[PDB]
Amino acid sequence: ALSLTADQMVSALLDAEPPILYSEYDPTRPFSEASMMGLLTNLADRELVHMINWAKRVPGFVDLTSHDQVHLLECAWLEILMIGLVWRSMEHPGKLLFAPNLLLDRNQGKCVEGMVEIFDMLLATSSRFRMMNLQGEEFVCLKSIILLNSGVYTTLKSLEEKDHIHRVLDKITDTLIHLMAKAGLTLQQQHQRLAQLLLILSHIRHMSNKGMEHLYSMKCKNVVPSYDLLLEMLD
Amino acid sequence: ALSLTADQMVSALLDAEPPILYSEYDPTRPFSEASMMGLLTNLADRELVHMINWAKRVPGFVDLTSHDQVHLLECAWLEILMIGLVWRSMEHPGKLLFAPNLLLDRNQGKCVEGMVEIFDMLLATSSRFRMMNLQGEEFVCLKSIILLNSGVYTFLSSTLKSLEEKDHIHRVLDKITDTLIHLMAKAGLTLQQQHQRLAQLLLILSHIRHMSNKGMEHLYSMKC
Ligand SMILES: CC1=C(c2cccc(O)c2)[C@H](c2ccc(OCCN3CC(CF)C3)cc2)Oc2ccc(O)cc21
Ligand SMILES: CC1=C(c2cccc(O)c2)[C@H](c2ccc(OCCN3CC(CF)C3)cc2)Oc2ccc(O)cc21
């Protein structure tokens, strides 16, 4: 019973949208590698709690095994963080709206070694959605595709589960086209926009893998005392 | 040559298909981590020469600057190796057809530290295309999308020239979308089944981008 009308599916996915969280950003003290990463980490960890709540209201998702729901989130979480980040940043050219009181330009990216690479990509993806005129109904469908699609490629039970996920992606495809039909695009423009949107999910998968490679290099590069750390122990 | 009918575009892309290359595999000298990686490297480097020849016969590609053709290949090469590898492996469940004389099962993957991880993914993607019943006309369209799509979100996006080039690439991806649907229409799928199949195909390009990045992380760890 995730086989509901296209208008029901959009309504369901709009409802499930998590809140737009606030940072505890301190505007008086300037940034540092340690402090900016600390800020963004706290934010991201808060968003992860709200994303699990969301995941449970996405039609089809709850129907799966727990092991499978865990697996799809483990595989999708940074993708969903990033499409979310990019969606909020549409109204603010050249900048990423990490939170309504936390708006970073490309140059503030450089405050973290090799973070600019991922910023430029997120900024580019933002620019793209803007020029596309991505609608919020389209946005929520993409978020759900990313959750269901990104874990699915990794017994009778496991087969019926893959098949259930594929049935739901079909429903969401149907919904996306319904939105495009309703918005008055020709059939050609419908298939072409559906294609342009799904091709972007591939750039978002790439942005994620790069981001993930970056986050790991930051954990690795603290098998070693910091300046901030060694400072206090004398002081 | 954005004037190409759907039947012309498929014919063009089928023509451009490279030959299925041979490995220097010597069945009179046992397997080795060193030797199998040496084999695969030699093969892949030979395929890269054939891929450039192909790339030049993909409609639109030649119209770009050299810098841009280079950039798209720099970003797409391992993706195209892998979709190629996956396509050839469809008819051989559990095994990867690296070449007609080089057919490795999952277990021969273990002969290289952490290579099984990438084998299982390529095998899974093979399983997927099989259950989809991917046609060779669909295959060649995906190959072309991967080349044109995977570099396009970098370029630079800050001069009149690079803008006209991004716009040209986007016009061609639109043409290839049109082609894919035409093939599905011709094969007699309903409109619903057409957009659903188009979606299922493009969602796999996402797994192929993922498989590539993992593969690339693996290739780096082997230079050691
Ligand atoms: C894209 C992006 C970030 C970003 C990401 C990569 C590179 C980069 O430069 C910035 C970092 C970030 C920082 C730390 C992260 O992970 C912390 C670890 N927790 C544990 C849990 C996994 F188990 C995640 C994730 C993202 O700040 C964000 C905050 C909110 C948001 O919507 C997106 C981001
Ligand atoms: C899936 C796959 C590979 C594969 C890929 C990743 C992981 C894995 O386990 C296997 C390796 C491989 C090994 C080395 C490679 O390149 C190294 C050097 N080349 C030349 C150029 C430098 F100038 C790069 C490329 C592919 O063998 C292949 C051969 C042909 C083919 O269609 C695909 C592959």
Swiss-Prot record, chain A:
Residue segments, region Transactivation AF-2: 5-235
Source lineage: Eukaryota, Metazoa, Chordata, Craniata, Vertebrata
Chain positions with Phosphotyrosine modification: 227
Subcellular location: Nucleus; Golgi apparatus; Cell membrane
Binding site residues for 17beta-estradiol: 47, 88, 214
Its job: Nuclear hormone receptor. The steroid hormones and their receptors are involved in the regulation of eukaryotic gene expression and affect cellular proliferation and differentiation in target tissues. Ligand-dependent nuclear transactivation involves either direct homodimer binding to a palindromic estrogen response element (ERE) sequence or association with other DNA-binding transcription factors, such as AP-1/c-Jun, c-Fos, ATF-2, Sp1 and Sp3, to mediate ERE-independent signaling.
Implicated disorder: Estrogen resistance: A disorder characterized by partial or complete resistance to estrogens, in the presence of elevated estrogen serum levels. Clinical features include absence of the pubertal growth spurt, delayed bone maturation, unfused epiphyses, reduced bone mineral density, osteoporosis, continued growth into adulthood and very tall adult stature. Glucose intolerance, hyperinsulinemia and lipid abnormalities may also be present.
Homology family: Belongs to the nuclear hormone receptor family. NR3 subfamily.
Effect after changing residue 88 to H: In ESTRR; highly decreased estrogen receptor activity
Entry's free-text remark on domains: Composed of three domains: a modulating N-terminal domain, a DNA-binding domain and a C-terminal ligand-binding domain. The modulating domain, also known as A/B or AF-1 domain has a ligand-independent transactivation function. The C-terminus contains a ligand-dependent transactivation domain, also known as E/F or AF-2 domain which overlaps with the ligand binding domain. AF-1 and AF-2 activate transcription independently and synergistically and act in a promoter- and cell-specific manner. AF-1 seems to provide the major transactivation function in differentiated cells.
Region of interest (Self-association), residue spans: 1-235
Mod. after translation: Phosphorylated by cyclin A/CDK2 and CK1. Phosphorylation probably enhances transcriptional activity. Self-association induces phosphorylation. Phosphorylated by LMTK3 in vitro.
Reported tissue expression: Widely expressed. Not expressed in the pituitary gland.
Lipid tethering residues (S-palmitoyl cysteine): 141
Included stretch of the parent chain: 307 to 545 of 595
Name under which the protein is recorded: Estrogen receptor
Miscellaneous comment text of the record: Selective estrogen receptor modulators (SERMs), such as tamoxifen, raloxifene, toremifene, lasofoxifene, clomifene, femarelle and ormeloxifene, have tissue selective agonistic and antagonistic effects on the estrogen receptor (ER). They interfere with the ER association with coactivators or corepressors, mainly involving the AF-2 domain.
Species whose genome carries this gene: Homo sapiens (Human)
Region ranges (Interaction with AKAP13): 1-235
Domain NR LBD, residue spans: 5-235
UniProtKB/Swiss-Prot annotation, chain B:
Post-translational note: Phosphorylated by cyclin A/CDK2 and CK1. Phosphorylation probably enhances transcriptional activity. Self-association induces phosphorylation. Phosphorylated by LMTK3 in vitro.
Expression (tissue specificity): Widely expressed. Not expressed in the pituitary gland.
Binding of 17beta-estradiol, residues: 47, 88, 218
Localization per Swiss-Prot or TrEMBL: Nucleus; Golgi apparatus; Cell membrane
Lipid attachment locations (S-palmitoyl cysteine): 141
GO cellular component: chromatin; cytoplasm; cytosol; euchromatin; Golgi apparatus; membrane; nucleoplasm; nucleus
Positions of the UniProt region annotated as Transactivation AF-2: 5-224
Keyword Transmembrane: yes
Designated name of the protein: Estrogen receptor
Gene name per UniProt: ESR1
